[PDB]
Design a protein around this ligand. Structure first.
Ligand code: GLU
Lengths: 281, 277
């Protein structure tokens, strides 16, 4: 018998991460619709190449609510931790050996039993792990400072780039994988490889700060940010489509029931309620 | 390595045509057979050679090349997509459950009750439940009071679906009063329903999102639209249905994800699913 080790990642509005209070508990708060926010204690590190000091923290959001629902449905207990290197996960050459980093590496090494995060389903990862059916259907878009005018993914300041207009995504992410694998995107990939950010929050802040002119990322995140911060807009629009899934090892005994529960939640309105609570208000 | 595969006509995902009276399928089409009865006083019938094309047929061609299999494609005759009737699945789902087909390809919606009896590939077309109306009809969604409490309005709103598929199953489970109200407006098929909307005999048609988005894109005059700027309730996808424990699922899943990631899928969407509107 064992508690599930759940790994997640900071990524608003799917996973908020906040300090505990002095006594080690999470502050009581309420949603926009008046209901209490469910929070869980999640351990993780508070700069690349430095030692990582793990401390208890508070986690909540769309994905944490989804976790609580799966746990109650399928009757498992769990402990949540934040991925130690802060990355979603890619497979990089080391040497002809390869390794996965990020949440993918923690799941494959046994440090995690389940990835519950806005984790994009793609061919590269599905070779190594099991994904559920998608709990969110979305795609990629482009975030810019209000007033910046670019048409989209085919705009010549992206396709014929210079140092005059800088764009980027998140290191060791599915967007990084996407641009690296499609030869037709190699001009964009070589430009971004010089400017990619360690996390989405840092990249978004860099757009607000006019140090990054366009950020290419998940539309589910970017449209939420633009709904909250009026100096930011997305520019259009879904140029690639993908979904987020729960990640498990291929020999997981939970994998069938997790997918059935995802499907039931789309069908009975639970997933829309989460959209209403965390995403679309 | 030679696989029985079942499908069902639903443009533009599967489109069925007569064979050249050459008996050869040409162009972008693949052979598909249909069992046609001789009469209604015998179980005898004939296989009729037809030709099949469409978004899903293009997917099957790519999977056959990539995963490396050949197939004999046939059109389902016992039901349509799949419904559980007295605890027995019919339609494409039933053909897979009862091991007459190795896989089912078409406009086949992934839902929880089907996933209990077949394995589904990853979704390769996003879909759900949408609502088609005449442009400017004010309906918030499925949760609109005009749908949920229809006799609160005088005269009441007239809306329906095509019974026996995933959309009617969802409504029956979620909105019991709406479901029993709307069966009076059951439509025999998508073409009948669009004619009913255009002539004012129906106010809304509730149906598969991907098919309605396709029809709205090609509506003469762009008068019929889906509500909420193409809003989808109960997001899901079409999926390839396989027997539970199928040894083909892993490869088929990896191949579909490869087509999505390398651009092959958006090519088929441009080729088959674009519309002027
Ligand atoms: N795609 C649906 C059919 C149409 C519908 O009910 O919306 C299914 O697989 O049942």
């Amino acid at each position: 018998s064992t508690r599930l080790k759940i790994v997640t990642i900071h990524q608003e509005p799917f996973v908020y991460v906040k300090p505990t209070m002095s006594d080690g508990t999470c502050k009581e708060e309420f949603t926009v619709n008046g209901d209490p926010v469910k929070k869980v204690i999640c351990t993780g590190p508070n700069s690349p190449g430095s030692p990582r000091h793990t401390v208890p923290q508070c986690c909540y959001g769309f994905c944490i609510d989804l976790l609580i629902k799966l746990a109650r449905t399928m009757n498992f207990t769990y402990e949540v931790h934040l991925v130690a290197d802060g990355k979603f996960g890619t497979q990089e050459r080391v040497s002809n050996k390869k390794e996965w980093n990020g949440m993918m590496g923690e799941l494959l090494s046994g440090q995690a039993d389940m990835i519950v995060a806005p984790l994009t389903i793609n061919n590269e990862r599905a070779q190594y792990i099991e994904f559920s059916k998608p709990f969110k259907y979305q795609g990629l878009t482009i975030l810019v400072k209000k007033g910046t005018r670019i048409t989209g993914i085919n705009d010549p300041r992206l396709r014929n780039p210079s140092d005059k207009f800088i764009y980027a995504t998140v290191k060791q992410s599915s967007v990084d994988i996407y641009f690296r694998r499609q030869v037709e995107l190699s001009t964009m990939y070589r430009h971004m490889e010089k400017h990619n950010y360690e996390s989405a929050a840092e990249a978004i802040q860099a757009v607000r700060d006019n140090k990054l002119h366009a950020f290419i990322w998940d539309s589910a995140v970017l449209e939420f940010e633009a709904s909250q911060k009026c100096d930011l807009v997305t520019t259009g629009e879904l140029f690639f489509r993908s979904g987020f899934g729960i990640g498990m090892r291929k020999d997981s005994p939970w994998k069938q029931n997790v997918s059935l529960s995802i499907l039931k939640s789309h069908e009975n309105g639970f997933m829309e309620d989460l959209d209403k609570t965390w995403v679309r208000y | 390595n030679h696989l029985s595969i079942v499908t069902l006509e639903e443009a533009p995902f599967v489109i069925v045509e007569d064979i050249d009276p050459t008996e050869t399928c040409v162009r972008n089409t693949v052979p598909c057979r249909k069992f046609v009865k001789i009469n209604n006083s015998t179980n005898e019938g004939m296989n009729v050679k037809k030709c099949c094309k469409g978004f899903c047929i293009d997917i099957l061609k790519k999977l056959s090349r990539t995963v490396k299999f050949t197939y004999d494609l046939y059109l389902v005759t016992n039901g349509k997509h799949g419904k559980k009737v007295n605890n027995v699945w019919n339609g494409m789902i039933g053909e897979v459950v009862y091991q007459r087909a190795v896989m089912a390809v078409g406009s086949l919606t992934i839902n929880e009750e089907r996933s209990e009896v077949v394995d589904f590939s990853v979704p390769f077309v996003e879909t759900g439940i949408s609502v088609m109306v005449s442009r400017g009809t004010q309906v918030t969604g499925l949760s609109d009071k005009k749908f949920q409490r229809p006799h609160d309005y005088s005269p009441p709103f007239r809306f329906g679906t095509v019974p026996n598929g995933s959309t009617e199953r969802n409504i029956r489970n979620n909105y019991p009063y709406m479901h029993q109200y709307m069966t009076r407006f059951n439509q025999r098929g998508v073409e009948d329903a669009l004619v009913s909307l255009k002539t004012g005999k129906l106010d809304a048609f509730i149906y598969d999102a991907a098919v309605l988005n396709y029809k709205a894109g090609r509506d003469e005059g762009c008068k019929l639209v889906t509500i909420g700027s193409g809003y989808i309730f109960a997001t899901t996808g079409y999926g390839i249905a396989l027997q539970k424990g199928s040894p083909w699922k892993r490869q088929i899943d990896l191949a579909l994800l490869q087509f999505v990631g390398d651009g092959e899928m958006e090519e088929l969407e441009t080729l088959w699913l674009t519309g002027i509107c």
